[PDB]
Amino acid sequence: RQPEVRGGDTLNVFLAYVPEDAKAMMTTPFEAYLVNDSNYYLYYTYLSAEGKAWNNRSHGLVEPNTKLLLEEFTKDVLNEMERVAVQLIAFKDGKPAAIKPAVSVELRIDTVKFYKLHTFSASDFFEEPALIYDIVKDDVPAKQVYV
Amino acid sequence: RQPEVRGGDTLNVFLAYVPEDAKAMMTTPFEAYLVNDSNYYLYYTYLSAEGKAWNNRSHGLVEPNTKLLLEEFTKDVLNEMERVAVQLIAFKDGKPAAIKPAVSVELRIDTVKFYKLHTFSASDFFEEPALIYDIVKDDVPAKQVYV
Ligand SMILES: [Mg+2]
Ligand SMILES: [Mg+2]
């Protein structure tokens, strides 16, 4: 087992979209991940807006210092992703911890970028370029950042 | 299976403390519950402060229109419960829903009341009197209410 990470008591959580095959942009589907770059467990939901309501696309637990595949989708699904949200709470289990904010972040996804690999960016989290949205950055929820 | 409840799309969530045996106040332990009077699933944590840090006492999922036993404790544990918190997120699974707030509520518990049954109140949720703290009342998180 891996130990906790130095600096990981600062909450850093990202929503990342990655091609399954960055070499085949015409045919590839995409993957959505919750990336938990922190020493906390998360409970989360990932939702998409449809009218005045929201549909839950994924929910559950993310362990410390890991990522979770939320969804695999083709580009036809982009029409459902005009506005998405991530809500979460963070905790440790059996270790004292700082209290963290309860987080809700609504995002307008840059769907044009899914046709343009060069608009995705290099990251430490994947070998492929990724489209990465902050949910919590340096303990600060990314409210009203991508809307 | 029970259907969703009329009015239950309004989030109402309570933290309730109940004696195991209201007839034996000298000897009885107490039970802490999360009461989810709503049509939403919840992920939650229940934490207690110790110094500048917090200890997780319970976490998980609560189903719609139910309650969950968080902890059974004796009165010696009241010394750990000077300040507690509940954090949660609410969602539906497979049904469209309104987006709900991500909630964090810190409470100073009225530990004197645990020696005085008449200070607990009748409720629809238990046959015994209960000490009930609002976490979300009529969709409004109970921030800075019990501090
Ligand atoms: Mg890389
Ligand atoms: Mg009653």
Domain boundaries, chain B: 12-147
Distance in Å, alpha carbon of B130 to nearest chain A alpha carbon: 27
Of the candidates B41, B55, B87, the beta carbon closest to that of A96 is on B55
Cβ neighbour number for residue B80 with a 10 Å cutoff? 15
Q: Known binder of ligand: residue B114?
A: no
For A7, the 3-state DSSP assignment is coil
Nearest to residue B67, comparing CAs of B127, B125, B131, B142? B125
CA distances from A8 to A40, A52, A63, A124 (A): 8, 37, 13, 15
- Alpha-carbon distance of A93 to B47, in angstroms, equals 10
Nearest to residue A8, comparing CAs of A31, A42, A33? A42
CB contact under 8 A, A89 and B44: yes
The pair of three-digit structure tokens given for residue A91, joined into one six-digit string:
């905790």
CB contact under 8 A, B88 and A89: yes
Experimental technique: X-ray
The pair of three-digit structure tokens given for residue B12, joined into one six-digit string:
């109402």
The pair of three-digit structure tokens given for residue A95, joined into one six-digit string:
């270790």
Residues 6+ positions from A124 with CB-CB distance below 8 Å? none
Of the candidates B85, B89, B93, the beta carbon closest to that of A43 is on B89
Place of tokens 């300040």: B83
Ligand nearest to the CA of A22: 1
The pair of three-digit structure tokens given for residue B90, joined into one six-digit string:
């609410």
Q: Are B130 and B18 in contact (CB under 8 A)?
A: yes
Sign (positive or negative) of CA dihedral A19, A20, A25, A28? negative
The pair of three-digit structure tokens given for residue B91, joined into one six-digit string:
């969602």
The pair of three-digit structure tokens given for residue B14, joined into one six-digit string:
């309570």
- Alpha-carbon distance of B85 to B54, in angstroms, equals 9
Judged on CB neighbours under 10 Å (0-12, 13-18, 19+), B32 is buried
Place of tokens 């049509």: B39
Nearest to residue A88, comparing CAs of A38, A135, A28? A135
- Alpha-carbon distance of B98 to A144, in angstroms, equals 18
Q: Are B47 and B54 in contact (CB under 8 A)?
A: yes
The pair of three-digit structure tokens given for residue B126, joined into one six-digit string:
């238990």
Going by the DSSP 8-state scheme, the letter that residue A97 receives in this structure is: B
Q: Known binder of ligand: residue B126?
A: yes
Residues 6+ positions from B60 with CB-CB distance below 8 Å? B43, B44, B68
For A3, the 3-state DSSP assignment is coil
C-alpha of residue B135 to centroid of ligand 2, in Å: 20
**Resolution for this model in angstroms, one decimal place?**
1.5
Task: Sort strands B103-107 and B84-91 into parallel, antiparallel or unpaired.
Answer: antiparallel
The pair of three-digit structure tokens given for residue A120, joined into one six-digit string:
């995705």
- Alpha-carbon distance of B112 to B122, in angstroms, equals 18
Amino acid type, A81: M
Please tell me chain B's helix, strand, coil percentages from 3-state DSSP, rounded to the nearest 5. Answer: 10, 50, 40
CB contact under 8 A, B54 and A96: yes
C-alpha of residue B4 to centroid of ligand 2, in Å: 22
Query: Which A residues, 20 through 79, put their C-beta within 8 Å of a C-beta on chain B?
Result: 41, 43-45, 47, 50, 52-56, 59
- Alpha-carbon distance of B140 to A80, in angstroms, equals 29
Nearest residue in A to B103, CA atom: A102
CA distances from B45 to A43, A48, A84, B10, B15 (A): 9, 24, 24, 20, 12
B16 touching A, CB under 8 A? no
Nearest to residue A100, comparing CAs of A88, A111, A110, A118? A88
Residues 6+ positions from B34 with CB-CB distance below 8 Å? B13, B14, B15, B16, B42, B44, B46, B58, B62, B67, B68, B70, B86, B135
Residue B33's H or E segment, with its range, is: strand B30-36
Cα distance from N-terminal residue to C-terminal residue, chain B: 39
Place of tokens 């580009």: A75
Q: Are A117 and A4 in contact (CB under 8 A)?
A: no
- Alpha-carbon distance of A32 to A132, in angstroms, equals 10
Class of domain B12-147 as given by CATH: mainly beta
- Alpha-carbon distance of B46 to B67, in angstroms, equals 14
C-alpha of residue B119 to centroid of ligand 2, in Å: 14
- Alpha-carbon distance of B77 to B41, in angstroms, equals 29
Cα distance from N-terminal residue to C-terminal residue, chain A: 39
Nearest to residue B104, comparing CAs of B63, B145, B60, B55? B145
The region, left, alpha or beta by phi > 0 then psi within -120 to 50, assigned to residue B144 is: left
